[PDB]
Amino acid sequence: NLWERFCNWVTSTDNRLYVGWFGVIMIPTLLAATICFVIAFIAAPPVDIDGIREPVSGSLLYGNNIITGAVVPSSNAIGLHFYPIWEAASLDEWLYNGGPYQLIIFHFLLGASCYMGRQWELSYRLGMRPWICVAYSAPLASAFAVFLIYPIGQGSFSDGMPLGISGTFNFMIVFQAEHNILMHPFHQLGVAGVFGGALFCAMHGSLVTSSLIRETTETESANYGYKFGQEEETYNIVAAHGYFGRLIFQYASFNNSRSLHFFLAAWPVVGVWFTALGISTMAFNLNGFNFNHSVIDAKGNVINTWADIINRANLGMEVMHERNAHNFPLDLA
Template sequence: MGSSTVDEWLYNGGPYELIVLHFLLGVACYMGREWELSFRLGMRPWIAVAYSAPVAAATAVFLIYPIGQGSFSDGVAGVFGGSLFSAMHGSLVTSSLIRETTENESANEGYRFGQEEETYNIVAAHGYFGRLIFQYASFNNSRSLHFFLAAWPVVGIWFTALGISTMAFNLNGFNFNQSVVDSQGRVINTWADIINRANLGMEVMHERNAHNFPLDLAAVEVPSIEG
């Protein structure tokens, strides 16, 4: 919003807008740069697609979250599950490396960067895991496995951003009462109104049914706090 003085700019949250909006613009442009680089190198754009998840989450948290109150729970399963399976896969890979060197040399010396040959035995690793848990919990195809490990956290973070963005605009939490008016009764919009709406949104979230307007907010008179 426009401000005529520095004090008004500071009061209206100018520094936050300046930093956050430039940050979001920067990370969005970086995502475009990742896509452009992969395109020029003839690669598939999965790096940019994966990076879109934290970009969406950052946009939801830093831009949408100050307006309302959202929920992070939608992405917990995706992030935790992806981390768990990635750690599990890493331990299986470490345990089934194909040694190309002697015992006196590091196993890392036997590999070339970008080599086509596999560096570990996926059949042995996930065959063991399939017997440890159950057969269909393991992967025999390396491409399918790594796609799953990448897609699960990314989709989880996408849903996190979606949950924050949708619940932030909970219209049942708005009361449209302005906090500052001038002598003529005209509204002076401030960030206090945004915070007020966020507080109402949080109170709605705590109700049993998020579609019901809280009774204490719907009351014409302010309820007494005396016993």
């Protein structure tokens, strides 16, 4: 059958890159988002992100370098409305209002969601256990948080994270002004997740490199002591555990490789999950702890803490973000 040949090739394990059914969506959507991103980063004209007819330049050809360049998010006048090309009277209007942003982020989110599914899929075709895709769900959820979830709760794709280095920082700063995310325990767990992951990654790598079993001379790389697919382990887990158990105390060390590797997966993934959830729940304006004026003296004078110093800085971001867009005294959008 001809459809069975197609299905046999879509699902082949002999392809240099695995395609698969998730890939039948992934490949076109990612290619579309990638091509449009490259073109808009170089060439897009200014975009009126805040919907106040004050366009924001973001591309290289319009006076940006790699650091200041962005694909600018679509207009605040658009809000959450869907805005493909065909909804616009002309390419010129589409570029002015932020069209490439929606095109890119929606194709990308679709493409990365299917990337996750592709990971389950090839793993199933290979006889593997299936949960690598669960780990990749932590950055995917984070991407979902800042491109889709946070716009939904706020009410405009214009509050999505710009596709750009400086645009990203403009997102972090305005976010802290509005939601106090440093004082939110879900971002703190994210910090604990990436710092801890960095630490543990550093740790595991130094401990295994430390226990490598002598197989080479000095005039060559220790790496040539491992050959792709040997059945013998290349380091000495017992020596590494002997070392690290003495560094702290023995029961604070791992003697089970599977138990240690599970810990390596779980610590950053969980912490990133929570920090995705922190962006996703601050989207609905459940904000970080507010301790402003929390400590008071017996007369009633405010006794500042460091929280009140954080507030003075938050205030200064607040009254300067979107400096022309507010006509009324409360920041409700």
